[PDB]
Amino acid sequence: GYDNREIVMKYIHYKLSQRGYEWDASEVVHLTLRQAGDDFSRRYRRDFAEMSSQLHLTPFTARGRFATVVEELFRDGVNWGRIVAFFEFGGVMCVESVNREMSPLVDNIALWMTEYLNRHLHTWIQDNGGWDAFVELYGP
């Protein structure tokens, strides 16, 4: 386990580099989340195909859409699958930001994700075994 900020930073850096974008700022947690995120994306590629246009992302819409989506995602519960979806949704927001010539937003989204993990998911994560539990359920 340890630090949510680093977990976010590493996840976002990886998702962006996959699209060839280099973003200026144990390891088993980072790798496991990468693997899970990639399988999530691989499986539900088609399902979220339209998403980037559904997002309709602008500097004025970004924070509101993030809140709306993340708050609704976890309204009636939390589980590791929903958390992986959360990370993937963030990744999509970042990729779309660069695409819509809003690359500075990437830093804001990383902050929003970090804050949300620290202030709203932290309790559930610790009560359910920490990132160590995630590693055992999802990783090698």
Partner: peptide, 21 residues
Amino acid sequence: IXIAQXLRXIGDXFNXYYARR
């Protein structure tokens, strides 16, 4: 609230696919 409920449905289904034991 689309995107969020259709992430949620699929997150839950995904968390199936990775059910304990």
